[PDB]
C-alpha cells in the first residue's frame, strides 16, 4: 500500500533550511539586463521572459 508514496531522500540530497535576506538580489538583477516591471522592456514582451524572485515578479529580460 505505501509503495511509491513513502519515498526516501538520496544520500546526497538535502533540504534547504537556511533563511537569508534577499533585499540585494532585485537590484543586482537590474544591474544585469532585467528591466524593472514598471519600465519599458526596450523590446516586445513576446520576445521577453518574466522574472520571478521567490514569488515576486521582478521584471522582464530581453531574450
Amino acid at each position: 500500500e505505501p509503495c511509491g508514496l513513502m519515498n526516501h531522500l538520496t544520500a546526497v540530497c538535502e533540504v534547504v533550511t537556511q533563511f537569508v535576506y534577499t533585499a540585494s538580489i532585485p537590484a543586482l538583477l537590474c544591474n544585469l539586463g532585467v528591466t524593472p516591471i514598471d519600465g519599458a522592456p526596450h523590446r516586445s514582451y513576446s520576445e521577453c521572459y518574466p522574472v520571478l524572485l521567490d514569488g515576486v515578479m521582478v521584471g522582464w529580460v530581453d531574450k
Binding site: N31, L32, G33, H42
Partner: protein
C-alpha cells in the same frame, strides 16, 4: 519653467554590466574517475590442505 512637451526621443541607450568570460570557455575540469579495483600484491596461498 513652463514645462512644455518636448519631441519624441530618437532611441535608447541601456547601460548594464557585462560578465567576464576569460575564465570560462576553458577546457573542462571534471572530477577524476576513481580507479577500478586492482588485485593487491603479495597474495599467496596461505591455506595448505591437511595431511
Amino acid at each position: 519653467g513652463g514645462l512644455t512637451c518636448a519631441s519624441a526621443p530618437q532611441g535608447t541607450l541601456r547601460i548594464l554590466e557585462g560578465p567576464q568570460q576569460s575564465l570560462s570557455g576553458s577546457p573542462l575540469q571534471p572530477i577524476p574517475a576513481s580507479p577500478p579495483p586492482q588485485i593487491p600484491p603479495g597474495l599467496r596461498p596461505r591455506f595448505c590442505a591437511f595431511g
